[PDB]
Amino acid sequence: VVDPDIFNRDPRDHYDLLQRLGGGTYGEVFKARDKVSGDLVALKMVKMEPDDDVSTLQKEILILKTCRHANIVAYHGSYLWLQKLWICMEFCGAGSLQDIYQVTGSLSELQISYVCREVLQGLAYLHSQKKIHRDIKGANILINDAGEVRLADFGISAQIGAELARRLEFIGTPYWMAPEVAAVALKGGYNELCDIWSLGITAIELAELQPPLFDVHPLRVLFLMTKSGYQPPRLKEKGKWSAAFHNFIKVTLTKSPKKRPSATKMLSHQLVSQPGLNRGLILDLLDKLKN
C-alpha cells in the first residue's frame, strides 16, 4: 500500500483538469482547479499498477503529508484510481526558478538574497523535523504568481529514504559489524548540512545560469570532490557581486560538514538578513519574464 491515507477515488470528482504542464520519467503534472473552492492545485500523476514498487512514492507522500510550513509546497492528499496515483499539492504558477531564469537570464543579487532566505526558512523547518531535502537546486524551488517561494520535488529525498529502509531490512546480523558500518546503513553517511552546500551552489546557479563545473563529466566531478585538496567553487565575476554575497558563498560552501553552518545560523547572515527582501523582488522578475 502506497500510503495509509490515500483517497481511493477519482480525482476528477474533486478537480477539473485544466492543463497538462509536462511529463516524463516521474509521470505527468497537471494544473487543476478545485470544483468547490475554485483554488488551483498541481496534480502529479504516476503509474501505480500491481507489483510495482511503492516504496519511493510512499516515502515522498510521507514527507509531504507531515510538512506544514509556508516555504514547503502544501499537500492536499493523494488519490489512487484505476492504477494511477495522483499527488495533490499547492499550485505554483511560475514553475521553478530554472523555468524562469532560462527566459529572464541571471537574477539580481537582491532577488537571489530573497530566494536564499526563503529556502533557508524551509530548510530550517525540514531539519527541525530531522528531514533532509537532498536535492536543493533551481529546478526544485518553485515560485507562485505572488512571488512566494516553495520547496518542492522530494523525489530524491524519498528515493534515499526508501533505499535506507531497504538497507535496514537486509542488513543481516550486526554483532560483528563495525560501528561506522552500522552508522552508514542507518543514517546514510552524511547529514542535513548537505542541503546548505546545495543552497550555495544554487545561489551560483541563479547568478550564472549553470552550477559550477557544469561542463565537466559528472564522474570526474564526483572524483574531484573526494580529493583532499578539493577547493569549493566561487562566483566567477568578482566585481558584479557584493562582499556579502561572496561571503555567503564562502560559508555555505564550507567543505567540512562539521564546520558548515546550519540553516538557522545562515538565516543570520548579512546577505539574507538585510532589509528590503520581499516577494516584490520576484514579482519584478516575473514581470520581466512576460515583458
Q: Detail the residues annotated as belonging to a binding site for ATP.
A: 21-29, 44
Instruction: Give me 8's grid cell.
Output: 481511493
Instruction: Tell me if 112 contacts a copy of itself by CB under 8 A.
Output: no
Residue 152: name its binding partner from ligand F97, a copy of itself, none (Cβ under 5 to 8 Å by kind): ligand F97
| 250 part of the interface to a copy of itself, by CB under 8 A | no
Q: Say which of 3, 99, 135, 153 is annotated catalytic.
A: 135
Nearer to ligand F97, 149 or 266 (CB): 149
Cβ neighbours of residue 113 closer than 8 Å, sequence gap 6 or more: 245, 271, 272, 274, 277
Selected from 184, 244, 267, 289, the binder of a copy of itself by CB under 8 A is 184
Distance of alpha carbon 204 from alpha carbon 245, whole angstroms: 10
Specify the DSSP class assigned to residue 238: T
Give the whole-angstrom CA distance, residue 194 versus residue 132: 8
193 binds, among a copy of itself, ligand F97, none (CB under 5 to 8 A by kind): a copy of itself
Interface residue with a copy of itself among 134, 143, 151, 152 (CB under 8 A) is 134
Do residues 65 and 47 lie in contact, with contact meaning Cβ atoms separated by under 8 Å?
Answer: no
Among 42, 201, 272, 277, binds a copy of itself (CB under 8 A): 201
Contacts of residue 228, defined as CB under 8 A and 6 or more positions apart, other chains included, come to none
Binding site for ligand F97 (CB under 6 A): 21-23, 29, 42, 44, 73, 89, 91-92, 95, 99, 142, 152-153
Q: Around Cβ 29, how many Cβ atoms within 10 Å? A: 19
Counting residues that bind a copy of itself (by CB under 8 A) gives 48
Alpha helices in the chain (DSSP H): 55-65, 97-104, 109-128, 155-169, 179-187, 194-208, 218-225, 243-252, 263-266, 270-273, 280-290
Shortest distance, position 29 Cβ to ligand F97, whole Å: 3
CB of 134 to a copy of itself, least distance (A): 8
To the query of whether residue 195 is one of the catalytic residues in this protein, the response is no
Number of helices (H) and strands (E), helices first, in the chain? 11, 8
Beta bridge partners of 41: 32, 90
193 part of the interface to a copy of itself, by CB under 8 A: yes
CB 139 within 8 A of CB 201: no
Beta sheet of 149-151, edge-to-edge order: 95-96, 141-143, 149-151
The nearer residue to a copy of itself, 220 or 288, going by C-beta atoms, is 220
Nearer of residues 1 and 178 to a copy of itself, judged by Cβ: 178
With CB under 5 to 8 Å by kind, the binding choice for 23 among ligand F97, a copy of itself, none is: ligand F97
What is the spatial distance between Cα 274 and Cα 291, in angstroms, rounded to a whole number? 28
Residue 186 Cβ vs a copy of itself, minimum distance, rounded to whole Å: 5
Q: Residue 103 or 183: which CB sits closer to a copy of itself?
A: 183
Give the span between the Cα atoms of 185 and 178, in whole angstroms.
Answer: 11
Q: Which stretch binds a copy of itself (CB under 8 A): 37-45, 75-83, 106-114, 169-177?
A: 169-177
Residue (20 or 265) nearer to ligand F97, CB? 20
Q: Which residues have a catalytic role annotated?
A: 135
Query: Which chain residues interact with a copy of itself by CB under 8 A?
Result: 134-137, 156, 163, 167-168, 171-190, 193-194, 197-198, 201-202, 205, 211-214, 218, 221-223, 225-226, 230, 255, 257
